[PDB]
Assembly symmetry: C2
Homo-oligomer: 311 residues x 2
């Protein structure tokens, strides 16, 4: 996954359970850019114990081998009906009691999952990623808690990856705007376009009245993405993408030009994207992205992008 002029971009897969790893590797995945950990929490009568979580994370870590696996801490919410969770009704569930916030106020979940991931990190290169981050305060508190549990495992005599990398899933406009200060604290970003676009454009995709307004290729959201990417690069770090847009061949060349460091998508699409990257010149795509992200409307931007693709 390196361009004709030598720009390397890690192309990975998204997985939901151990099984999907097989199909990922069959399709040439260069790693796991997103491990959805919802499968363990959903459809149970009790929270998935730390031992079961450790077993699953071990399974994936060992199934990958030399590849790195990014674990996404719980990202559930109100919509997903979990009967043993006693959820509250919210006027705007898409904007309410969900993701990291649940974890932070229900500390059992955090403790279990973080300890499990830390233990599993001893059998592979694991990375921890948090969703729905909005403030540097949350990341600092989370680093405190991570160090607490790291020491708790040390005092128990259990081995873990002391150099374990921590990252944020930049899916809120807040994290995108304060991206430079978060990049001063964590190791990587993974934007997950879906939620970033929905929050930036203030549009619910599952609302047929304005579904026509969901445009991840609009200058606003794409320039926020470029801001996050440049923030990561300013700190000598990197940014990835695991949202659907990563698996979109219409945006692959543009995102490459923007300097994106990692693509993560559903296994099936990995080959196509790979090909594009291997047959594109990174500097020309960077010039394209520079010219594009300066347009005021999605249509002019797409005109330029498709014009470039016309070669």
């Amino acid at each position: 996954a390196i361009t004709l002029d030598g720009h390397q971009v890690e192309v990975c897969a998204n997985i939901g359970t151990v099984r999907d790893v097989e199909g990922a590797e069959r399709n040439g995945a260069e790693g796991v850019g997103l491990y959805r950990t919802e499968f363990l929490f959903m459809d149970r009568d009790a929270l998935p114990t730390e031992e079961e979580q450790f077993a699953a994370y071990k399974a994936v870590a060992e199934a990958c081998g030399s590849q790195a696996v990014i674990v996404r801490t719980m990202d559930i919410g109100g919509d997903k009906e979990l009967p043993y969770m006693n959820f509250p009704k919210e006027e705007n569930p898409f904007l309410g009691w969900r993701a990291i916030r649940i974890a932070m106020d229900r500390r059992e979940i955090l403790r279990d999952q973080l300890r499990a991931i830390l233990r599993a990190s001893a059998f592979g290169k694991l990375r921890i990623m948090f969703p729905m981050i909005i403030s540097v305060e949350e990341v600092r508190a989370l680093r405190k808690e991570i160090e607490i549990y790291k020491q708790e495992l040390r005092d128990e005599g259990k081995a873990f990856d002391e150099s374990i990398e921590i990252g944020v899933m930049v899916e809120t406009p807040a994290a995108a705007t304060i991206a430079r200060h978060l990049a001063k604290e964590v190791d990587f970003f993974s934007i997950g376009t879906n939620d970033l676009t929905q929050y930036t454009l203030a549009v619910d995709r599952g609302n047929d009245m304005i579904s026509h307004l969901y445009q991840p290729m609009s200058p606003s959201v794409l320039n926020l993405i470029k801001q996050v990417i440049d923030a990561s690069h300013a700190e000598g770090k990197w940014t990835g993408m695991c949202g659907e847009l990563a698996g979109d061949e219409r945006a692959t060349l543009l995102l490459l030009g923007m300097g994106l460091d990692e693509f993560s998508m559903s296994a099936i699409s990995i080959p196509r994207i790979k090909k594009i990257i291997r047959n594109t010149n990174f500097e020309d795509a960077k010039v394209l992205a520079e010219q594009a992200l300066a347009q005021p409307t999605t249509d002019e931007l797409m005109t330029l992008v498709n014009k470039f693709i016309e070669e």
Copy 2:
């Protein structure tokens, strides 16, 4: 409303009906920074015709006199408020079929409201403000419609302010990011922090479980705000404040430091704010805002803000 070093800031009030105008002037209001036009649409069974809106807007425009009045186009929403609108039920009303869009796809609203406002602009300096703008595409379509209705009104023999000023209420992060491109098309900005903070931090204020996360004074929202202000100034234009935060003396000094051009509130607080602006140095507040908005945490920001005091 001028500082001791000579920075002028038009400080206005927000109003809900003609009556409230009185309360503004008693407190030294220098204008109306936003006329909320929901009062006419709510508690009805039919859309308020252009004539009723024209009467109300004329009333306000003439009640002000030489002052400028910013009328805010409809900002309706909600689960199901007025049944004569045949609302659809939506999982996320705060993120769904909102006013500005409501107007655009139910176009009768546009012609009615814009015709009324343009006609009333002949009796005072009126300005039009749009909420919930997210894209230059929407603003361009609305400018097309505004010119359509201005010319159509000309052929009807009605007089209006040919220099009628147009502005955007920047309440979505999208509009905040494309502020420079929007400033090349409209005349002014007027930020609605209420909704902007909710959209940037992805927090529903009316959700008690995470209400503690609503922080309009966090570096994220405030840096988006400064982005909008500098975008307006880059185009030689101006930006105002219409959210509740404008009426907060805790933030007024900082907002002035950021280069804000207008404050708008329910009038009651105008005296307080007035004093502050006249008793603060704009350049010192500029330095304060520069160093403050560079902090990574809300608490450090608040520390510096209160330290200045």
